[PDB]
Design a protein around this ligand. Structure first.
Ligand SMILES: CCCCC[C@H](O)/C=C/[C@@H]1[C@@H](C/C=C\CCCC(=O)O)[C@H]2CO[C@@H]1C2
Ligand SMILES: NCCc1c[nH]c2ccc(O)cc12
Length: 295
């Protein structure tokens, strides 16, 4: 059974797709951000088309494996949040039917846009209700469910408060200083963090995601070294890959990467809004939190 997406998940999708497809220029990027924020799939060009493909696949309305829309997932998305939604039976019926009629002829950006575009023009507001595409609807859901990570909340402090609670402050302090204490709480902590960073999904590690956090610190040159390590790690548990990285010649680079990613986890739109990498600010922020934790 397919599981509906949380507002954390869809916000991850939206921000990641914008990161991947917004142009690096300035005059160009502003148009795209302004339009996409209003859910306007304009202007119609390769940038917008591939952004559309990326969102459609992150929301998982389009299946890359089966290479086809899976319309039943619409229904799923709705039932999971059918009261907080604001969506009606008729709206979801028609949206599901329209998506059921789509056979895009291929899976390129251009063809998927050409297929789905009239559906989006017609049912954009249904899509925004179902997939938490408004600040009000997402806020309603967050408020209904205390187990979801919030917008401005760090993945790491979230996972800490779920895994350690108010117990083992000493082990949590050592863990936040990158100690391999080997305790059960630290293992669950690293699993929680890897799941939320998408370093691991459905049990399989995601080497491209770690590599990308290495690129984000201007250490792309380490990508091969980051692959060897992860491809040679014999375990399958997050703590295994974590320890492989910490007990390596790229330990300190890994900490720089991890800390930047923590900072960017407390605000999914960090790169969209235009923030850049600043090792000093990153570590200053980390030092404030760690001095509080180890207080
Ligand atoms: C099928 C294609 C749909 C196009 C995608 C659409 O262009 C989405 C844009 C995202 C939006 C989602 C809106 C609200 C979600 C809640 C955001 C919040 O918690 O502040 C904003 C957050 O990333 C961007 C801007
Ligand atoms: N800023 C890095 C936070 C971090 C990295 N590894 C950790 C392990 C435990 C913990 O509580 C926190 C952490």
């Amino acid at each position: 059974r397919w599981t509906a997406l949380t507002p954390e998940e869809t916000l991850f999708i939206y921000t990641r797709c914008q990161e991947e497809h917004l142009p690096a220029d300035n005059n160009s990027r502003k148009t795209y951000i302004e339009n996409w924020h209003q859910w306007k799939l304009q202007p119609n060009d390769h940038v917008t088309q591939c952004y559309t493909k990326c969102v459609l696949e992150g929301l998982e309305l389009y299946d890359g494996k089966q290479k086809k829309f899976r319309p039943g997932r619409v229904s799923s998305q709705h039932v999971a949040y059918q009261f907080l939604n604001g969506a009606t039976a008729d709206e979801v019926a028609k949206y599901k039917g329209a998506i059921d009629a789509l056979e895009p002829a291929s899976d390129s950006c251009e063809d998927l846009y050409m297929a789905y575009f009239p559906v989006h023009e017609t049912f954009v507001n249904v899509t925004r209700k179902l997939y938490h595409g408004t600040v009000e609807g997402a806020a309603r859901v967050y408020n209904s469910d205390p187990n979801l990570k919030r917008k401005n909340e760090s993945l790491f402090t979230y996972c800490e408060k779920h895994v350690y609670g108010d117990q083992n402050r000493e082990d949590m302090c050592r863990g936040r200083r990158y100690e391999l204490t080997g305790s059960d709480e630290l293992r669950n902590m690293i699993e929680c963090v890897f799941r939320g960073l998408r370093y691991i999904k459905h049990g399989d590690i995601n080497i491209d995601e770690i590599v990308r956090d290495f690129d984000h610190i201007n250490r792309g040159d380490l990508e091969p070294r980051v692959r060897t390590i992860l491809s040679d790690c014999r375990g399958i548990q997050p703590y295994d890959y974590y320890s492989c990285l910490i007990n390596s010649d790229i330990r300190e680079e890994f900490k720089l990467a991890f800390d930047y990613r923590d900072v960017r986890s407390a605000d999914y739109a960090y790169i969209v809004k235009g923030n850049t990498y600043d090792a000093q600010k990153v570590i200053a922020e980390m030092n404030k939190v760690e001095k509080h934790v180890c207080g």
